[PDB]
Amino acid sequence: LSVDTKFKTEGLCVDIPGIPKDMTYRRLISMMGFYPNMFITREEAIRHVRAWIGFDVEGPLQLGFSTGVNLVAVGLPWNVVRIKIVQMLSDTLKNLSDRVVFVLWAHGFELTSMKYFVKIGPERTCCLCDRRATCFSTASDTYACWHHSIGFDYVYNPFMIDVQQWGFTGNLQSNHDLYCQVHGNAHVASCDAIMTRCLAVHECFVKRVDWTIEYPIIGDELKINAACRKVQHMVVKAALLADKFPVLHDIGNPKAIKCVPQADVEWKFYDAQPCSDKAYKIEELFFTDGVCLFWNCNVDRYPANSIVCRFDTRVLSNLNLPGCDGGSLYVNKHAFHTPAFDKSAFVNLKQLPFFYYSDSPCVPLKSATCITRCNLGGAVCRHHANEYRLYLDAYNMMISAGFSLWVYKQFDTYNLWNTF
Numbered sequence: 001l002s003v004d005t006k007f008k009t010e011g012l013c014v015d016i017p018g019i020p021k022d023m024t025y026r027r028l029i030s031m032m033g034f035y036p037n038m039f040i041t042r043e044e045a046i047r048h049v050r051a052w053i054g055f056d057v058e059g060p061l062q063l064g065f066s067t068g069v070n071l072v073a074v075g076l077p078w079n080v081v082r083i084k085i086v087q088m089l090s091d092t093l094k095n096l097s098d099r100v101v102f103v104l105w106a107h108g109f110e111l112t113s114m115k116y117f118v119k120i121g122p123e124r125t126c127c128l129c130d131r132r133a134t135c136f137s138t139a140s141d142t143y144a145c146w147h148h149s150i151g152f153d154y155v156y157n158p159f160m161i162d163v164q165q166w167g168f169t170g171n172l173q174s175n176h177d178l179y180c181q182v183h184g185n186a187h188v189a190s191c192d193a194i195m196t197r198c199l200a201v202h203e204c205f206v207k208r209v210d211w212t213i214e215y216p217i218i219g220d221e222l223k224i225n226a227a228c229r230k231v232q233h234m235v236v237k238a239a240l241l242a243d244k245f246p247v248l249h250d251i252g253n254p255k256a257i258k259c260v261p262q263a264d265v266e267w268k269f270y271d272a273q274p275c276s277d278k279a280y281k282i283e284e285l286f287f288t289d290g291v292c293l294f295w296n297c298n299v300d301r302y303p304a305n306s307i308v309c310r311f312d313t314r315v316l317s318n319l320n321l322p323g324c325d326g327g328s329l330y331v332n333k334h335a336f337h338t339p340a341f342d343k344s345a346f347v348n349l350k351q352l353p354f355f356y357y358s359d360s361p362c363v364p365l366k367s368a369t370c371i372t373r374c375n376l377g378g379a380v381c382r383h384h385a386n387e388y389r390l391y392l393d394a395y396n397m398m399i400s401a402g403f404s405l406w407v408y409k410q411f412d413t414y415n416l417w418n419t420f
Ligand SMILES: O=C(NCc1nc(C2CC2)cs1)c1cc[nH]n1
Pocket: 058, 059, 060, 061, 062, 072, 075, 186, 187, 188, 189, 190, 191, 192
């Protein structure tokens, strides 16, 4: 974002009466009392969604953050408030991003408060590792990343974006409430901060959707994705073996592949991209023959003859970010906004029980859920013991990452034993 780009100042003129209508970012930064630009484009913001922290200041000043924290600066003086800000941001962001992006609905006080807890300069590295520096300490004159900032007092080279520059009519609440009923306005700064981030997420990940953007690996992305593939193949293979459906309706990703390539079923594909806003209405999408597979195809009510994987947006993890209207922004390689988990969608189904099935050739493993020829015969062999434990690990990884599994009520693993 060029510092010579124009900044629309109308939103700031109640806190800053007389502000010039003609204003560049260069001038704004100077007026703020201060790494080419502190402010960033929407495109840069979207790439760094994991770093978004909503931030509002209301006038003694109340500072609100999308973390829910409200701090009062006078109430405590800025030299202690800034220490809290560093700690809060470090703990929130250390496992998410290499920076912070303050998401604003700027009316003035937030921008003029930055001088009191922000320092800027050349891009730097941490004193104790190779990560970029996000904090500065006036005590030791050293720099740190989010992981090594304990006892640091200033945020260093933060980034920020004013949502009000995107072309809105009306105030924050009126624009936020058009899309979301989950964040109230309790007239605390943190409430505005949360609404501001929520509006931003909606505009960039619900209204618009860019699946070309890739996001760095920050956790168990790869293990989770491999487990999801392993579980999908297991559950679908077993379902076809147990109930011998003549046809399978695979509803979802237009680029989906047969997950059980050696199955005898008639495999029919139906295209549906991830629904970012509201769950798909089954009436519109639609199938009573055979079985329907909804692998991360979120519908309002699944048919009774279904196999389902549905992401639970309430799960707490470094991959799952708070979203809009109860939804969550799941960032795993790509960013997927996901409508809120709704248990009523599974009323026609039941939870899929854990099991391990294998027809491959054959501490000792004892388990009622190791469905193998050797267990049928009384003693699980080493190979299938090894594979059972690896599958169980993958199964638990995918559950812990927030995915939930559902199946037609007639599904019975007892029917798999006679495949041997
Ligand atoms: O009234 C809001 N916050 C309450 C406030 N307390 C202070 C100071 C400690 C005395 C300033 S403002 C509000 C309005 C919109 N969002 N929050």
